[model samples]
Target chain A: NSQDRKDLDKFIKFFALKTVQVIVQARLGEKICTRSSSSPTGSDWFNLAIKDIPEVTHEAKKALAGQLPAVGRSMCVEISLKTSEGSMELEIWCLEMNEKCDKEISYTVYNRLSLLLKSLLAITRVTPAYRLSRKQEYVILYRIYFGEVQLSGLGEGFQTVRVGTVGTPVGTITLSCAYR
Target chain B: NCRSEVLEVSVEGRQVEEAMLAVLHTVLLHRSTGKFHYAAAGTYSIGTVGTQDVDCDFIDFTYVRVSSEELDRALRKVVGEFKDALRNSGGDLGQMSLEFYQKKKSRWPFSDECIPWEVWTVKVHVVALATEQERQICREKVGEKLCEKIINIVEVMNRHEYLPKMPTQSEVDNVFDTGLRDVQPYLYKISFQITDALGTSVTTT
Candidate 1:
């Protein structure tokens, strides 16, 4: 019980500092997402193809090991990252998150997920990808911290966290400190 | 402070006659140097005029390959694009513009294998300014207009089949704010790429 209490306290402290960092950093920077829907087609995907897209995805084995879930499907979303000159191109996919959550909860999750997915659309030129497949889904459970996508390729969903990409704000918030 | 007026066609205003406080990132290289060059597009956060502090964001660089004779032509094209961007944003009536030419001495930042022989070179400049409310309106419009102009230039350069989309109003404003806050009101940088004798590329700062 003593060790458990100590560990919990340590985790709490870690999150406190992180939360402050996010709040301060958020003031200095902007978090924008752009989204565009496509069927592997035309002009729409240009934004994503270019550096305009944020959140690079890559393929990987499900942590479930041997139980790799091949259940969901994937789709590409055109994205455009805005700049002084104009919008840059980028691409992303919204693979359906696993159906592990309750059916009712999953439906709500999808709604929340869509809202989150839509947030990325605010990105200037590139579009964010959304997973429409019922079986094949990639639900984001925890926040992630990765830098921008320096290297990208098609068919690569979310892979290892990017090296210099911005850390997830939610996690950062939980970890950062605040004045107010 | 010594300042010069820039007669610029902006995306925000049709024609703006602005008096720039001064120019930043001016590079003086001997014509015979074999240094290479590269350029990028991003937000600039500048400090108060006549200061040394600055900041930048979302910078993405690209290469521009042209011969000596064609250099002037390329510059003209760049200027034209800037003008067009301003015009589309309703700046056709204002005068004065800032262009950035951010470069690195080497692509690796510390390498010198492809230094240029030229002593004086010109590159693009991206700038952010602290302006009055009226001026900000012009800037916001310019931001939107330039977005269109930039897309055209990129399309030509990359030969991209599909044209990219522009960010909505809020997105563009956010970028402007990011760059605006970096330098404390007015700030800017220019980025460009040049070729080396060995046919290699280099970015200079």
Candidate 2:
């Protein structure tokens, strides 16, 4: 059971890395839709909200959705962090890869996910925040992926931010801006 | 119209030739602004420093008041375009060729026509600048820098109690020597030309 949980964690980390990459690319295009105060007409907050659903997020979600052993086998896990300002949520999604064992899933998913993340991190301005315990952080979940997930404490004091999702073959994870 | 001499000689490669042109443009034309037919026609020996192997080539160009500053800006811009071209073809700096064509545009012979005039097209050839000897000199310089970095890394490793098996002094020396040997063929190239309507020398289009 411990080994199973370890494998699941590995899967989720890789999935999250790749999903974040796509989300960042998607966000780059969405910035143009942001309400610029300098515009002749006042910017619409609601419309700006509509632009936040990045296209890559949909594709990434669909990719994970298709990986489930059965259709509709999905769950969204939100990990919350309470900083000096307020709280942040990290979403994790896990879906089983097509008939792959835990070890196979861990290795394959890690390679693909880390490569995608490496390229994505190079171009995106999105900051990473983790929500894992100190003891778990010591373990290498799979190669370079650590057991603990944590956020790097972004934004000014009391600033509210919503982080992106991490998807695994078994599930999907996301960060939410929780009510104070 | 008076034109400069037609001098032509091909070097071993494009990069070396281009580097030579960049040097010439900076020295002879850039910021030496005036109406002049100044042209140099010769087969200059070109190569990296500290290397006996050199290529002789004919490079030629003429220009109006050329600004090295403009030339500097243009070259930087061109490098960006050059990178895009290289990436598109799945290649790098080593696998590229450059050519400059003197494109000219002119209006119909004399009317109060509200039209723009075209100027002479400046040609450029990319050439290798530093000889092998120069590269070796550069390698040694780089090796010195690397030695500093290595020593720093060693100090950090020694400080960390958790870190196992710090590298010995002889090991550090060996690494430095091997690194210097590996840092060969340190050559360079530059591409520049007048690329604006005002004929300000820029790097690439």
Candidate 3:
């Protein structure tokens, strides 16, 4: 009981911060107005400005030392930013929490997330693959950000934490924080 | 954006247009980031564009398309011009493209410049038809072949991995279309290339 309580608390805090970091890092610098956070108290605030899609809820699991038995489905954090003119979608899908836990959530979650995300962003940005995909329209710049996802968050459920605006705003991005 | 290809065109006239239209709609359906607005528009939530299906008259096919005045205008104008080029060539030949670019600021000398990031070129060498009889049949086969080409185009787009370091707040326009606000648009242009007999003329907007 002692160990379970501590780890769950750690998991919640670690994940809450993670949701924002991952999304923001992807879009990097941008202007945001968040609200209408659906299904919860702050939900209305998030919804009024931007809407957070509830595709993945904060369903989490904690596993103890080695025998390896953690069963938590993946969760997604999605946001659609509307600048009175147009809109955009930013999503970070399935953040997993694996490995034996007595070592702290960071012990393995960070390790696994680092590798997984590296694989993810690499596919999204690496020169070889990325350059090959580039063309005239590709030059039009869909969007870009260059930053390292330092293997890492807070509470788990969905929330429209931020909406990025450009020109009149920032980078025209909207990255909603996630659920653990 | 260097895909200058010479293709075989087995269908002509209205049917040729149908074949090309099929490919155009296919690519946009997969790439356009706009939603089908009110009556104006599903399971699709608000803020995202929805799709409408179209059944091809040439082949046994059902494809998807986006509904937006801006997108339609952009696509229609190019295909029409490409058609015109084909007729002018007399040899049933020419190339058309759908390109994406970023509008960036020039040095002290100038103002704006569009650097293309990606492009799709469809070059066709129209094969004269002996019989109108095979015209319909040939198109069915052409449609089938086009499905493969579309597969190739879609596959490449799906695998695209990187977007690169972005422009700072002041240089942000280098990465986005800070123009008439879907939330923000990805800048794209369409052009037609007529070579050999006519030299080089273009239609880019």
Candidate 4:
């Protein structure tokens, strides 16, 4: 299951990448509403044009099935965006094909992860169509959506991840997490 | 009067033509709505015309170009002349304008007037550099800068609500481009000028 574990981790990180792309487009034009049921199968929103929902479900099954710790557990991921104006959250409920999997949170890793994402928005801000500006901090929170569904068992009140910080052109910005 | 906005095209000597090509092509691509004609002019065309990606040289960049040999030739013609001027003038600086307009009639005896609805001026500043490593870095740097440039253009295209209004049946030919055979959107023209080190300016169309 080592290979299974690696694939699951990669799957988890894809959410962060996709979230950043959506918000970067937000700074350029209109705010995006994720594709709804009424929206056609082929159309894409948020300027992060790729594919539709079926693939995510497929990827979850292929990459996530073997790694689930048990048969009844599901995967809940929270990838959020925090701007100067405020926050907009996204949740991907990757229903564990077989109940399973994961988190340990710390400050330096959080700081680095956020910066790595921040530095990403920093570097690509130059590419055509991919954009972010100097003053705004695109703060993203990566956490387990619902802490209750866990391997150690669902006796929890709440479980949240660490805070991350990335400064602006001259100012500072942050994101906080706690499932309540 | 259509207000003109200048797009800064700052780059080194070697990459100027390709830089101009990418910037000007993208601007024209977005400004047009098939009215610029991708097919043989004076002919009928059909079936879901669209854009194609162009991978550029001198920089690691890709941009959507309208799928038309007609526009393909037009852009090359302009950038070709631009490069010629740059060479003759020692590559210090050059400028070009892409203007979109609608034709309007005057009272009584006057001939039709070409009324520009929008004008985008691209001002190119060619810098000199030594060292192959620095030039390599400059290529990537310029790529990033142009990416930001095009991004801003898209932002304006998205939020700023301005373009020539739809033309009535008789006015269609006058408002939309006659050269492009696809969806006739609007009429546009490009002009060029170059400046030497002594500050004397020369103009060409």
Provide TM-scores for the models: 0.21, 0.20, 0.45, 0.52
DockQ of the candidate models in sequence: 0.03, 0.01, 0.03, 0.04
Worst 10 residues of 3 chain A by lDDT: A164-173
lDDT of 2: 0.29
Off by over 4 Å in 4: A1-180, B35-47, B182-185, B196-205
Error of 2 at B19 (Å): 22
* Maximum-DockQ candidate: 4
| All models, RMSD in angstroms | 21.9, 27.2, 17.9, 17.2
DockQ of 2: 0.01
Q: Rank the candidates by DockQ, best first.
A: 4, 1, 3, 2
lDDT of 1 by residue, A109-169 (tens): 2222221211122111211211111112132111222212222533344332110111121
| Candidate 3 per-residue lDDT over residues A1-180, each given as its tens digit | 476445544433344333433333333222222321112233222112223323211221111111111234223433233444543333333333333233322223322222222222212221121222222212111111111211133223433212111110001111222222
Which scores better on DockQ, 2 or 4? 4
Model 3, B42-146: lDDT tens digits are 122223332333455765433444434455556667788777777877753566676666766778889787776666667665666778777777765665666
Stretches of candidate 1 off by over 4 Å are: A1-180, B1-8, B11-131, B158-205
Off by over 4 Å in 3: A1-180, B1-10, B35-46, B164-185, B197-205
What lDDT is reached at residue B142 by model 4? 85
- Computed on C-alpha atoms, the DockQ of candidate 3 is 0.03
> What is the docking quality class of candidate 3?
incorrect
